[PDB]
Amino acid sequence: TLNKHISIPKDMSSKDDLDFHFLREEGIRYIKELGSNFWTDYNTHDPGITMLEVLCYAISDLGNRINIPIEDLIANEEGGVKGQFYKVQEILPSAPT
């Protein structure tokens, strides 16, 4: 119950919705498959590409909140779990027969 030293991992790669670079590459792959007849310039000054990067950033934010633990996601303003769960003191005991 002592404090531990805190650090951050260095392998920032997951190939999922929390991985910015992964999302960006998939975005471009989809664009070529669907619209390369008309949209071929994928340089960084392009408004199209700019919009893609903004959206990828927004997706990471959403994924990060989905991973918040249950204890907080279903918390009540006043604390407790009154409308969510029945407690052991209430749901496990049996009438005496």
Binding site: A58, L62, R65, I66, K82, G83, Q84, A95
Partner: protein, 158 residues
């Protein structure tokens, strides 16, 4: 709010010397981008309702949700009827509307919660049709919610 000032869609606006046409084009872009924001706002809104969807006291009437977006300076002009931005429930009915098949979805949620206690309400599906017509769908969902609320005593004092 993630774009540069050059685009002209941020809080500080766009300098007057650049002319009206450029200001108009900025308005057109704001319109376009709302198609992406309204969807994202819905997903965030849906997280806020998990507590209600699985409540033992009383669930919600809707299963899909949306939000007004108000951190955009001209939304009062972009929308044909600003009234909806004053009430997320009206906005939900207008934007999602029928796509939300509430009767079937509400039953699936209730059946799951009931199953967690190893109980089963399948027979209401037809027994109630000897008492009521089309009105059984509302009646049955009300009864299932009552059952969960009263469960602590029901399963114990046998």
């Amino acid at each position: 709010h993630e774009f540069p000032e050059t685009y002209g869609i941020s809080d500080i606006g766009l300098p007057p010397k650049l002319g009206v046409k450029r200001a108009v084009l900025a308005r057109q872009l704001k319109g376009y981008l709302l198609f992406f924001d309204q969807i994202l706002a819905s997903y965030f809104e849906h997280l806020s309702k998990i507590k209600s969807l699985l409540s033992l006291d009383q669930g919600p009437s809707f299963t899909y949700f949306t939000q007004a977006i108000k951190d955009i300076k001209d939304v009062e002009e972009l929308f044909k009827d600003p009234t909806l931005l004053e009430n997320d429930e009206e906005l939900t009915k207008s934007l999602i509307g029928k796509l939300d098949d509430t009767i079937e979805r509400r039953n699936q949620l209730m059946d799951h919660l009931i199953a967690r206690f190893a109980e089963n309400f399948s027979s209401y599906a037809f027994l109630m049709k000897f008492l009521y017509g089309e009105s059984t769908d509302e009646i049955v969902l009300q009864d299932k919610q009552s059952f969960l609320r009263e469960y602590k005593e029901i399963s114990r004092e046998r």
